[PDB]
Design a protein around this nucleic acid. Sequence first.
RNA 1: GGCCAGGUAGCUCAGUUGGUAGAGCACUGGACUGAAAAUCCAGGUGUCGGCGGUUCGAUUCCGCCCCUGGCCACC
Length: 367
Amino acid sequence: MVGQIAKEMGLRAYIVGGVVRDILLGKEVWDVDFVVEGNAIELAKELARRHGVNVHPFPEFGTAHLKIGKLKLEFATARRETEPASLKEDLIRRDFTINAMAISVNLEDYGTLIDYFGGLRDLKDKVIRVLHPVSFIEDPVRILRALRFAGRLNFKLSRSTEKLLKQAVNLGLLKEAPRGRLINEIKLALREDRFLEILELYRKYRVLEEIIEGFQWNEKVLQKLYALRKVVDWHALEFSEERIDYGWLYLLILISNLDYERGKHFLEEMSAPSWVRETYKFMKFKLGSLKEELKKAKENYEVYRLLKPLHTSVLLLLMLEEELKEKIKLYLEKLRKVKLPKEKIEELKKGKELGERIEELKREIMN
RNA sequence: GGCCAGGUAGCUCAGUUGGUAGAGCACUGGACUGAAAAUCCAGGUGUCGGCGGUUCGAUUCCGCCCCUGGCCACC
Ligand SMILES: Nc1ncnc2c1ncn2[C@@H]1O[C@H](COP(=O)(O)OP(=O)(O)OP(=O)(O)O)[C@@H](O)[C@H]1O
C-alpha cells in the first residue's frame, strides 16, 4: 500500500539499509527502514491512518514511526548530511556498501534493487567496504561496526577498508569517539552468536586496548574463550531450554585479569544485567576458594550444597576446569533430579526443621 | 529499544541466610450517645505487579510480560 500512497502523493519511497541487506541475505526482519523523497511524515501519517493505527511523528528529525501487526515501520526523509536531497545522497552518507543499497517500493519499478556503489558485488564477494577514504575518520564507531559485521556475515575487509581502519585506530580516533556509541556498539557485538570471531577481529586490530583502559591480550584468556565456546556449545545443546546470555560470560573472561575498579566501572558503563555483576564479583574473589572446596568434595551432598545456590553462569565458569567438568555435568543431568511419593512425604511432615529434615533425607538418598 | 531502581493495605512507607508478615490515618461491629464525634476493647488492614518454571514449600531463585520514574541509544 506504501507504493500506492506514495503514488497519490507524487513521491518516491524506498526500502533502505541493512533491512535491504537482510532481505538479500534471505533473513526476514520485522523492522523496515524507509527513505522518502519529499515529506515522509505525511506519508507515515496517511499509512497509519488507512490501517487505523497510531503514529509517532518526529518533525525535527523528519522521521515517523508506526507499527502494523508485528511490523515496525520507520519513514525517514532523504538527507545528504547526518534543497531536497536525492536518494543517492542519502545512501552515500552511510557506512558500508552492503548497507548502502535500496529497493524501490514505487509501483512502476517495484521489486528493483537500486545499488550505486556496487554493494551487491561486495555482498556476493563477502567484502566489507567503506564508501569513502574518510569514512572511519568521520565516524570512528564504524571501526567496531565493520568488524562486527565481518564477524556476523563472515565477510572480509577490503585492502582499502583495512588500511583505512588501521590508520584510523593508529590516530587514536577511537578515544575521541563518544563513549556511549562505542559501549553500545560492544553491547550490540556481544549479542552475536559469532561474537567470538568479532573478538578475534577486536584482538587483531587491537581496538579493545583503545576502548578499555588497562586491557591487554594474552594466551590464557584466549584459550579460556575457546573453552568457554565449547562449554557454551554443549550447554546450549543439551540444556538449551535453560539458555541465558552467553556473551556476558566472554566479557567477564576478557576483564578477568583487569582490576576490580576498572572492571566494575566498565560493567557500569556497559549497563550489564544484575547476574553479570554478581557473577563477576563472585569470580574475582570467592571463585578460587570455591574451586578449592570443590577439590575437597567427596560426598555428592557437599557438591549439591556448594553448587545449587549458585547461578548457571557460575557453573559454566566452573566447567572451565577440566577436573570439575564431569562433576558439574553430573550435577546437571543427574544429581539435582529426584522426587518423593505421597505417603512418604506425609510421614516426613508428621518450620525450618522440615527443611533440615528434607535435606537429611536427600543426603541420605545421595550417599 | 538497553539498563537501573521503584510495585507492600484506601494513601504515605520498612522487610535476605526460602519456613507460618508490619507502622501512622480511613473499614466493619459492639460497649459509649437524644444524634454525632472522641476514645476503649479489639479485630478486615494483604493471592506483598501479572503469568509460567525450579523447589516438599517462592514476596525471595529464574524466565516471559504489565505499570511508573530515571540514565540513555534515540542512525
Ligand atoms: N555510524 C554509522 N555511519 C553510517 N551509517 C550508519 C551508521 N550506523 C548505522 N548506519 C546505517 O543506518 C542503518 C541502521 O540500521 P541499524 O541501526 O538497525 O543497524 P544494522 O546495520 O541494521 O544492524 P543491526 O540490525 O544488527 O542493528 C544501517 O543499515 C546503516 O546503513
